[PDB]
Design a protein around this ligand. Structure first.
Ligand code: E64
Length: 208
């Protein structure tokens, strides 16, 4: 497969977003991969609604956390997801409003655990969600360069891998542009379960 890929360079990734002070990383990462597969398939780049998920996804827990599988499953079950414009983000949970089904997906697949080759194969197809230990201070204060740790493998933050180079993953965070490299962080590729456990629980939506 390609030595390097960057979906941002292919117009598959929307501008960086800020989940603000609400534990919704499960929504932002999930929605981003949806926005991505949709553009890759339809040629349309559309910003989708995290808030919808936050409000209408019982299986997950609004600002109190969530999981990849359920998010995807929701979007699928619900028959589609609405745009960022009609259902803006509020950084605080609320009653499920009715929403327009702008974008739809057919399924989602898991990438084999702690297998960075498989993950490379997946990212080469389309951006993917991953869980990382984002609890270390070094990571939280990461500003630039190829981050190589330290960070454990305790899964607590959800992000997206939008591309890669020979020795690092191009990760998209949901903390705005004033964190890392204009919102992104280049995480070294170290095999095993990966840096901060980045290769522990990867996934990507599917659209036929
Ligand atoms: C695996 C990734 C997505 C971490 C995830 N935590 C979150 O969603 C966030 O707090 C992420 C964030 O940056 O806000 C998580 O696993 N949290 C657990 C929440 C459990 C929900 N509460 C229960 N058990 N009812």
């Amino acid at each position: 497969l390609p030595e390097q890929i960057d979906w941002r360079k292919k117009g598959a990734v929307t501008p960086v977003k800020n989940q603000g002070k609400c534990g919704s990383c499960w929504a932002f990462s999930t929605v981003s991969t949806v926005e991505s597969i949709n553009q890759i398939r339809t040629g349309n780049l559309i910003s989708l609604s995290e808030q919808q998920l936050v409000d209408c996804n019982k299986k997950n827990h609004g600002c109190k956390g969530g999981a990849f599988v359920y998010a995807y499953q929701y979007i699928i079950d619900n028959g589609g997801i609405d745009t960022e414009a009609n259902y803006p983000y509020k950084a605080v949970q609320g009653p499920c409003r009715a929403a327009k089904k702008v974008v739809r997906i057919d399924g989602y697949k898991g990438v084999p655990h702690c297998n960075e080759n498989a993950l490379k194969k997946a990212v080469a197809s389309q951006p993917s969600v991953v869980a990382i230990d984002a609890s270390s201070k070094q990571f939280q204060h990461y500003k630039s360069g190829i981050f190589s740790g330290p960070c454990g493998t305790k899964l607590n933050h959800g992000v997206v891998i939008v591309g890669y180079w020979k020795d690092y993953w191009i990760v998209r965070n949901s903390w705005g542009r004033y964190w890392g490299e204009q919102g992104y962080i280049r995480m070294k590729r170290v095999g095993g379960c990966g840096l901060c456990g980045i290769a522990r629980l990867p996934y990507y939506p599917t659209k036929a």
